């Protein structure tokens, strides 16, 4: 089906504790494959997936070179933002950036991205048209005007339409063993009496990949939208994910609840019931 590649960067100033820390990671779908941390002993972009290790020295030398310069630019940008916001040099601030592309089953560009956030809030973003910008405030408008005059959109567009999709396709072929394999969730339901009047029904989904998943409880076939505790999809640490959904049920009515699991790895959506 569809696939994506993303590069994530975040710089955090720490006044009086050296230069801003810079950390960037790369992903293809939900798989981390590259990383760079400025605080590392001898800072270099490192592989984090088997299928990227085959890349030669020129690849890594270039990536490393690129990450270091970005670290430098983020530093200059952090200073600029202090001005744009009339802020002190004494406080810590955060500059975040993400860019990447999405391609469909035909390996063709579906969507391209490039957005920035300052201290957790939206700052400036390249529009889906890959040629226009959206600034969140007047400070970000300063940037929009500089980028429109420098025609940054065109350079980004060129990359997103070309290299981005072409290297992604390359990574997809080289890591197809894992990147093009959906791991369906292994599921089951648990029962935990809470008192003589009620019990907890918990629907589990484990070892699944990718992360995208739908888990829902139904009471007499009606979605318990406003009565379902749903934890955030979490990583198992082995590359797969986990998740669960729970509902407090009146004891004796357990059989009126059904769990529904939807996942790219399942030929059909699953429906489970608590069966003692």
């Amino acid at each position: 089906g569809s696939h994506s590649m993303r590069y994530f960067h975040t710089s955090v100033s720490r006044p009086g504790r050296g230069e801003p820390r810079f950390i960037t990671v790369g992903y293809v779908d939900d798989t981390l494959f590259v990383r760079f941390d400025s605080d590392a002993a001898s800072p270099r972009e490192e592989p984090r997936a088997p299928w990227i290790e085959q890349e030669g020295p020129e690849y890594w030398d270039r990536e490393t070179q690129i990450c270091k310069a970005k670290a430098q630019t983020d530093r200059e940008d952090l200073r600029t933002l202090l001005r744009y916001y009339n802020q002190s040099e004494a406080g810590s601030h955060t500059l975040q950036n993400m860019y990447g592309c999405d391609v469909g089953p035909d390996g063709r560009l579906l969507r391209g991205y490039h957005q920035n956030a300052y201290d957790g809030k939206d700052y400036i973003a390249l529009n889906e048209d890959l040629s226009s910008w959206t600034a969140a405030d007047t400070a970000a408008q300063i940037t929009q005007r500089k980028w429109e005059a420098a025609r940054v959109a065109e350079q980004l567009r060129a990359y997103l339409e070309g290299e981005c999709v072409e290297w992604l396709r390359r990574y997809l072929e080289n890591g197809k063993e894992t990147l093009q394999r959906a791991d369906p969730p292994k599921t089951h339901v648990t029962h935990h009496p809470i008192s003589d009047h009620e019990a907890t029904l918990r629907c589990w989904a484990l070892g699944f990949y990718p992360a995208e998943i739908t888990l829902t409880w139904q009471r007499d076939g009606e979605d318990q939208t406003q009565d379902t505790e749903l934890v955030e999809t979490r990583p198992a640490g082995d590359r797969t994910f986990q998740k669960w959904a729970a509902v407090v049920v009146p004891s004796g009515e357990e059989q009126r609840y059904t769990c529904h699991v939807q996942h790219e790895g399942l030929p059909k959506p699953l429906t489970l019931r608590w069966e003692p």
Partner: protein, 100 residues
């Protein structure tokens, strides 16, 4: 400034099985800023050799991290995750529950 408290989830990589080696995980997400202290504990004591993923963030820009460590559970030993964050007036401690 807008500060977001971290969500905490302490669980094992595989279904708990006393005497069988596993991995204890403490996933912290949805927090901002990125400055954060995380410790895994065994019977109230901090565990050495704990590793963690490199800082990353979700669509809403909030940060997430995975702290982990290999361990062999028992019916006796207690495991928990202790987190510190500017949004926290004091260290939050979430006990491990093999059923969550």
């Amino acid at each position: 400034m807008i500060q977001r408290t971290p969500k905490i989830q302490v669980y094992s990589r595989h279904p708990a099985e006393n005497g069988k080696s596993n991995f204890l995980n403490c996933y912290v997400s949805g927090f901002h800023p990125s400055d954060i202290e995380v410790d895994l504990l065994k019977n109230g004591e901090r565990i050495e050799k704990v590793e963690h993923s490199d800082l990353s963030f979700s669509k809403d820009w909030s940060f997430y991290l995975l702290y982990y460590t290999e361990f062999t559970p028992t019916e006796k030993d207690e495991y928990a995750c202790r987190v510190n964050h500017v949004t926290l007036s004091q260290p939050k401690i979430v006990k491990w529950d093999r059923d969550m």
